[PDB]
Amino acid sequence: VMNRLILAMDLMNRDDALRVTGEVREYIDTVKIGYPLVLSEGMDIIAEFRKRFGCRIIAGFKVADIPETNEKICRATFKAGADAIIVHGFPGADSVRACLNVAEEMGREVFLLTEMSHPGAEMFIQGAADEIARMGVDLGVKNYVGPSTRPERLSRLREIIGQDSFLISPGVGAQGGDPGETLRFADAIIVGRSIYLADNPAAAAAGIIESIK
Amino acid sequence: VMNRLILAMDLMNRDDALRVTGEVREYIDTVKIGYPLVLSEGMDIIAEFRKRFGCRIIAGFKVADIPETNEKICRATFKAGADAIIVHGFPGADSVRACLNVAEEMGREVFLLTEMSHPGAEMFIQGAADEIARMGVDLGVKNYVGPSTRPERLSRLREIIGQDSFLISPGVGAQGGDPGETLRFADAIIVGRSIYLADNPAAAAAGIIESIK
Ligand SMILES: O=c1[nH]c(=O)n([C@@H]2O[C@H](COP(=O)(O)O)[C@@H](O)[C@H]2O)cc1F
Ligand SMILES: O=c1[nH]c(=O)n([C@@H]2O[C@H](COP(=O)(O)O)[C@@H](O)[C@H]2O)cc1F
Ligand SMILES: [Cl-]
Numbered sequence: 062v063m064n065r066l067i068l069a070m071d072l073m074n075r076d077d078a079l080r081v082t083g084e085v086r087e088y089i090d091t092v093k094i095g096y097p098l099v100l101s102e103g104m105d106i107i108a109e110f111r112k113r114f115g116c117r118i119i120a121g122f123k124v125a126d127i128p129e130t131n132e133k134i135c136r137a138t139f140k141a142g143a144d145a146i147i148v149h150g151f152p153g154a155d156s157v158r159a160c161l162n163v164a165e166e167m168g169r170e171v172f173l174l175t176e177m178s179h180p181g182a183e184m185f186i187q188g189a190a191d192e193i194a195r196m197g198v199d200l201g202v203k204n205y206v207g208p209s210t211r212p213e214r215l216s217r218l219r220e221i222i223g224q225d226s227f228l229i230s231p232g233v234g235a236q237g238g239d240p241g242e243t244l245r246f247a248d249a250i251i252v253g254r255s256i257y258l259a260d261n262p263a264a265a266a267a268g269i270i271e272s273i274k
Numbered sequence: 275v276m277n278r279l280i281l282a283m284d285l286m287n288r289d290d291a292l293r294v295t296g297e298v299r300e301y302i303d304t305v306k307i308g309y310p311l312v313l314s315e316g317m318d319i320i321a322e323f324r325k326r327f328g329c330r331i332i333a334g335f336k337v338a339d340i341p342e343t344n345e346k347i348c349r350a351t352f353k354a355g356a357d358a359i360i361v362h363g364f365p366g367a368d369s370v371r372a373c374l375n376v377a378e379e380m381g382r383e384v385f386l387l388t389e390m391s392h393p394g395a396e397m398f399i400q401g402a403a404d405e406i407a408r409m410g411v412d413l414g415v416k417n418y419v420g421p422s423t424r425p426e427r428l429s430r431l432r433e434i435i436g437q438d439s440f441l442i443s444p445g446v447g448a449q450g451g452d453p454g455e456t457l458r459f460a461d462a463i464i465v466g467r468s469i470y471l472a473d474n475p476a477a478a479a480a481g482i483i484e485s486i487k
């Protein structure tokens with residue numbers, strides 16, 4: 062990923078989303094698009110980003126349904142042009158495998174979300190996170206998502222998945238995570254509000270990159 | 275809910291989804307629409323269902339993001355016309371409260387998903403389900419979702435939420451759940467494939483209703 066920086070584009074109207082992404086297009090080649098934008102503007106927005114910016118698109122949908130429905134969601138998402146999709150690991154192995162099947166069939170990628178970055182993640186997710194990570198490793202998952210807000214947890218996740226696995230991490234900036242510290246373990250950081258809500262998105266992105274040069 | 279029957283409309287194209295729902299419109303007044311249909315046809319499909327069938331719409335999105343993003347998803351979903359939204363409880367209390375805030379503001383409902391119906395749910399969700407249910411009760415949540423595939427678990431969920439709470443349950447039909455048995459604890463059953471994939475959807479719906487007269 063260019064500059065180890067993935068833009069989380071969660072603005073909810075096409076004009077703003079496209080304008081801000083355009084402002085920082087020179088600093089990134091990977092954008093994470095989620096439900097805030099997709100539900101507001103439609104899935105066609107994914108193709109718009111790919112054509113306008115030539116960027117990789119990660120659908121941050123965090124699929125968490127039964128196997129059959131997960132397959133349908135992945136199919137629809139990849140048909141829309143997404144290069145990868147984020148999947149929740151908490152629902153179990155069968156739900157993850159359903160996504161892996163579609164990804165292999167269509168030549169796309171699955172990112173396994175192991176532990177989340179918000180406070181509430183401590184209640185139920187954290188206690189299952191290490192096992193979720195091991196589940197991914199046992200199934201051959203190569204891409205993971207871990208929390209920037211809990212450095213020691215992110216470090217443990219890295220130990221479980223190994224050096225060869227790709228790890229991205231949200232929670233940088235607005236949620237309190239530090240770019241440099243997070244990159245001690247993750248290969249790339251996900252940054253949303255710190256950039257898209259900044260008075261000068263380009264300056265914000267450049268500042269983050271400067272701090273991790 | 276009419277006939278204690280909620281149609282899970284997971285077909286992925288407008289014509290088929292509307293045609294099948296029309297075939298069974300006399301048997302239901304509540305439809306659960308999820309990502310398979312919404313991502314394929316756009317969120318405007320919710321308003322289409324409401325105007326064509328005059329039915330209640332439950333968005334089976336099972337929101338499972340951080341508080342800030344959950345708020346955005348709920349806002350977009352309710353703006354689209356959904357009467358209620360299903361929210362995953364595993365991400366914690368703050369993520370649930372974010373949804374409750376928007377629902378209260380817009381005069382809509384939140385359904386808390388405790389335990390899931392598929393096999394993989396046993397890995398991590400099941401062990402946290404009773405506590406997730408208690409979390410909902412402590413926050414004043416009145417609508418819940420529990421598994422038809424595990425009758426004793428559904429029974430335990432009912433005991434935790436009390437007789438006053440509203441409980442709906444998926445996993446009936448295709449996943450093996452029995453309509454009558456499930457209704458010993460749930461107030462309404464969610465049925466998808468057993469109806470929408472049937473040779474005669476109307477006959478399938480009528481048959482289910484007949485078995486629970
Ligand atoms: O654990 C997680 N934490 C997150 O913050 N996210 C997403 O990353 C993004 C974080 O953006 P921020 O604005 O930089 O906080 C946003 O899209 C979230 O929904 C997902 C996760 F899986
Ligand atoms: O635990 C769950 N099990 C489910 O099956 N579902 C949804 O209910 C529906 C079940 O449909 P079926 O075709 O009757 O199995 C479908 O939309 C699922 O995504 C959600 C859940 F939260
Ligand atoms: Cl995400």
Ligand SMILES: [Cl-]
Nearest residue numbers: 334335336360
């Ligand atoms: Cl659902």
